[PDB]
C-alpha cells in the first residue's frame, strides 16, 4: 500500500550499496533504511560489466562481484541486507517523486515515504537513436550500461563469434569493449570522430600508446568520423555502418559508447542543478534539507582545486555515498563531519594493460619510461605540470606499489627544478617529495 522509512537511498548501483555499507557500520537499525532499485539484482561493482562479465571462458557472474568485493571490503549478498533489517526493494523504478511530501510512487503505483532521502540514481546511455541516425534501431546495435545489458551483449557475442564488431566511441567503453569483443575472437574495428582515444583524459602521446598496441592486437582504428546510417537485413539485423566520410563497414555487432547523462530528471526543477547535475555542498546535501546526491549525480565542491565539479569516476561513487551518510548521522549527532576531500582518480584495464590516473589532467604533460607498444612488459608514465607543480599523474603497468607513488604526487602537487631529472628519473622523481 504505501511504506515509510526514515532513510531512503533511491537506486541499487554502485553508491546505493556503498551508502546502505555506510549506513550498517553507523548503527542503522533494523527497518530504519530502505534502497529502491529498478534492477532485479542487489548492488554490484558495474565496472567488471565491460571487463570480466564479457570474458570468453568462466566470465565473472553475479553473486561474485557485488559490492563491495571492487574495493576489497565484504560482499554484500541479498541476505546481508534483510539481515540487517534493511529493505532491498528491486525491480521498483520511482516514476515520480515529491520532496515537497516527502513522497516516491513507484511505475506499478506503490507509494514510499521518507524523512531523509540518498539519491543516487547514476547515468543514462546516450542512444544513436537521439539523434535520429538512420537504422540505429536495428538488433544487434547495442549499448552497456546495466548487467540486463550486459546479458545481451554477451548472448550476442555468442551468436556471432567469428563475426564483425563495430564498435563506435572513443570513450573507457569504446577502449574496454573493443578488447573484449577482441578477446572473443571478433574482427573488430573502432571509430569515433575525436582525434584520439580518451579524448578528455590521454594526451595525444598517451593515446599513441594504445592505438598502436590495439592495432597490434588486430583491432583496427578509424578517427575523426562518426556513423550516420546503419544497413540491416531482412530479420531488422545490422548488416553495416556508414561513416560520414563516405567509407562503409560489414557489421554483424555494433557496440556503441558515446557517453552518457545523470538521470537526474525525477528531480528537475525541485532541487538546484549545476553543470548538468544536482548541485551539492561538501556534505553531498542539496538545496532541499535532508536531501543528498552522490555518485554520478551530483555537482559538488571540489576542495583540492577550488572548483564545483561533476564525475563519473566509481571510486567517487564509493566515497561521496560513505560521505552523505556519515553527514547525515552527524546532523543526527551533532558532531562535526570533515568537507569532503576527494583526489580524482581513474582507471581502465584493457587486454592484459592496466592504467592509473591521479589528479587534474591540465597544463603540460610529459611523458617518461617507455613507451613502445612491442615491449612484452609495458610500463610508462606521464605528468602534469601547472604552475611549476606537478597536478596529475598517469601510470601504465604499474606495479601496486608505485600507483600509491603517483597518488601521493598528484595530492601534494610537488614542485618541479628540472624537466631533464624528471624525464629519466620518472618514478624515481616521486620519491623526493
Ligand atoms: C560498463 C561500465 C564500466 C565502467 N568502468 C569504470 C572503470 O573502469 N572505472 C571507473 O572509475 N568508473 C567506471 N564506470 C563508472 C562507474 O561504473 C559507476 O557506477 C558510476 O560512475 C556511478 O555509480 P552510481 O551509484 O552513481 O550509479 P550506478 O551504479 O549507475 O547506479 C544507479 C542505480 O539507480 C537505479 N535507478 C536509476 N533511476 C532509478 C529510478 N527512477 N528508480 C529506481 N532505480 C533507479 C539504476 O538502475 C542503478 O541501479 C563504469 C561504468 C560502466 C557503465
Same mark, same amino acid.
Given at each position: 500500500?504505501?511504506?515509510?522509512?526514515?532513510?531512503?537511498?533511491?537506486?541499487?548501483?554502485?553508491?546505493?550499496?556503498?551508502?546502505?555499507?555506510?549506513?550498517?557500520?553507523?548503527?542503522?537499525?533494523?527497518?530504519?533504511?530502505?534502497?529502491?532499485?529498478?534492477?532485479?539484482?542487489?548492488?554490484?561493482?558495474?565496472?567488471?560489466?565491460?571487463?570480466?562479465?564479457?570474458?570468453?571462458?568462466?566470465?565473472?557472474?553475479?553473486?561474485?562481484?557485488?559490492?563491495?568485493?571492487?574495493?576489497?571490503?565484504?560482499?554484500?549478498?541479498?541476505?546481508?541486507?534483510?539481515?540487517?533489517?534493511?529493505?532491498?526493494?528491486?525491480?521498483?523504478?520511482?516514476?515520480?517523486?515529491?520532496?515537497?511530501?516527502?513522497?516516491?510512487?513507484?511505475?506499478?503505483?506503490?507509494?514510499?515515504?521518507?524523512?531523509?532521502?540518498?539519491?543516487?540514481?547514476?547515468?543514462?546511455?546516450?542512444?544513436?537513436?537521439?539523434?535520429?541516425?538512420?537504422? /540505429? #534501431?536495428? !538488433?544487434?546495435?547495442?549499448?552497456?550500461?546495466?548487467?540486463? $545489458?550486459?546479458?545481451? &551483449?554477451? *548472448?550476442? @557475442?555468442?551468436?556471432?563469434?567469428?563475426?564483425?564488431?563495430?564498435?563506435?566511441?572513443?570513450?573507457?567503453?569504446?577502449?574496454?569493449?573493443?578488447?573484449?569483443?577482441?578477446?572473443?575472437?571478433?574482427?573488430?574495428?573502432?571509430?569515433?570522430?575525436?582525434?584520439?582515444?580518451?579524448?578528455?583524459?590521454?594526451?595525444?602521446?598517451?593515446?599513441?600508446?594504445?592505438?598502436?598496441?590495439?592495432?597490434?592486437?588486430?583491432?583496427?582504428?578509424?578517427?575523426?568520423?562518426?556513423?550516420?546510417?546503419?544497413? /540491416? #537485413?531482412? !530479420?531488422?539485423?545490422?548488416?553495416?555502418?556508414?561513416?560520414? $566520410?563516405?567509407?562503409? &563497414?560489414? *557489421?554483424? @555487432?555494433?557496440?556503441?559508447?558515446?557517453?552518457?547523462?545523470?538521470?537526474?530528471?525525477?528531480?528537475?526543477?525541485?532541487?538546484?542543478?549545476?553543470?548538468?547535475?544536482?548541485?551539492?555542498?561538501?556534505?553531498?546535501?542539496?538545496?532541499?534539507?535532508?536531501?543528498?546526491?552522490?555518485?554520478?549525480?551530483?555537482?559538488?565542491?571540489?576542495?583540492?582545486?577550488?572548483?564545483?565539479?561533476?564525475?563519473?569516476?566509481?571510486?567517487?561513487?564509493?566515497?561521496?555515498?560513505?560521505?552523505?551518510?556519515?553527514?547525515?548521522?552527524?546532523?543526527?549527532?551533532?558532531?562535526?563531519?570533515?568537507?569532503? $576531500?576527494?583526489?580524482?582518480?581513474?582507471?581502465?584495464?584493457?587486454?592484459?594493460?592496466?592504467?592509473?590516473?591521479?589528479?587534474?589532467?591540465?597544463?603540460?604533460?610529459?611523458?617518461?619510461?617507455?613507451?613502445?607498444?612491442?615491449?612484452?612488459?609495458?610500463?610508462?608514465?606521464?605528468?602534469?605540470?601547472?604552475?611549476?607543480?606537478?597536478?596529475?599523474?598517469?601510470?601504465?603497468?604499474?606495479?601496486?606499489?608505485?600507483?600509491?607513488?603517483?597518488?601521493?604526487?598528484?595530492?601534494?602537487?610537488?614542485?618541479?627544478?628540472?624537466?631533464?631529472?624528471?624525464?629519466?628519473?620518472?618514478?624515481?622523481?616521486?620519491?623526493?617529495?
Amino acid at each position: 500500500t504505501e511504506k515509510h522509512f526514515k532513510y531512503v537511498v533511491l537506486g541499487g548501483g554502485v553508491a546505493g550499496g556503498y551508502a546502505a555499507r555506510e549506513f550498517a557500520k553507523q548503527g542503522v537499525q533494523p527497518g530504519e533504511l530502505a534502497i529502491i532499485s529498478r534492477e532485479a539484482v542487489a548492488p554490484y561493482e558495474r565496472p567488471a560489466l565491460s571487463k570480466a562479465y564479457l570474458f570468453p571462458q568462466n566470465p565473472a557472474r553475479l553473486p561474485g562481484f557485488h559490492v563491495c568485493v571492487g574495493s576489497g571490503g565484504e560482499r554484500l549478498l541479498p541476505e546481508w541486507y534483510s539481515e540487517k533489517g534493511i529493505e532491498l526493494i528491486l525491480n521498483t523504478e520511482i516514476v515520480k517523486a515529491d520532496l515537497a511530501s516527502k513522497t516516491l510512487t513507484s511505475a506499478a503505483g506503490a507509494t514510499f515515504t521518507y524523512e531523509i532521502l540518498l539519491i543516487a540514481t547514476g547515468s543514462s546511455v546516450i542512444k544513436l537513436s537521439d539523434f535520429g541516425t538512420q537504422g /540505429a #534501431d536495428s !538488433n544487434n546495435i547495442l549499448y552497456l550500461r546495466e548487467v540486463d $545489458d550486459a546479458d545481451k &551483449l554477451y *548472448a550476442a @557475442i555468442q551468436a556471432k563469434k567469428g563475426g564483425k564488431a563495430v564498435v563506435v566511441g572513443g570513450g573507457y567503453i569504446g577502449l574496454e569493449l573493443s578488447a573484449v569483443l577482441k578477446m572473443n575472437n571478433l574482427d573488430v574495428t573502432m571509430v569515433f570522430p575525436e582525434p584520439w582515444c580518451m579524448p578528455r583524459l590521454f594526451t595525444a602521446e598517451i593515446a599513441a600508446f594504445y592505438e598502436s598496441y590495439y592495432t597490434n592486437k588486430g583491432v583496427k582504428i578509424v578517427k575523426g568520423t562518426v556513423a550516420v546510417g546503419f544497413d /540491416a #537485413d531482412a !530479420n531488422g539485423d545490422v548488416t553495416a555502418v556508414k561513416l560520414k $566520410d563516405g567509407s562503409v &563497414l560489414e *557489421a554483424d @555487432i555494433v557496440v556503441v559508447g558515446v557517453g552518457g547523462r545523470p538521470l537526474t530528471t525525477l528531480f528537475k526543477g525541485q532541487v538546484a542543478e549545476e553543470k548538468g547535475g544536482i548541485k551539492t555542498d561538501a556534505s553531498f546535501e542539496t538545496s532541499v534539507p535532508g536531501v543528498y546526491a552522490v555518485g554520478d549525480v551530483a555537482t559538488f565542491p571540489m576542495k583540492i582545486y577550488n572548483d564545483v565539479r561533476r564525475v563519473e569516476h566509481v571510486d567517487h561513487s564509493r566515497k561521496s555515498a560513505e560521505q552523505a551518510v556519515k553527514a547525515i548521522k552527524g546532523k543526527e549527532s551533532g558532531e562535526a563531519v570533515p568537507e569532503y $576531500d576527494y583526489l580524482p582518480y581513474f582507471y581502465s584495464r584493457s587486454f592484459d594493460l592496466s592504467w592509473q590516473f591521479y589528479g587534474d589532467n591540465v597544463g603540460e604533460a610529459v611523458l617518461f619510461g617507455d613507451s613502445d607498444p612491442a615491449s612484452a612488459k609495458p610500463k610508462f608514465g606521464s605528468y602534469w605540470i601547472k604552475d611549476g607543480k606537478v597536478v596529475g599523474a598517469f601510470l601504465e603497468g604499474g606495479s601496486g606499489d608505485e600507483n600509491g607513488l603517483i597518488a601521493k604526487v598528484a595530492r601534494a602537487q610537488p614542485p618541479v627544478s628540472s624537466i631533464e631529472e624528471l624525464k629519466q628519473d620518472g618514478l624515481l622523481f616521486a620519491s623526493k617529495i
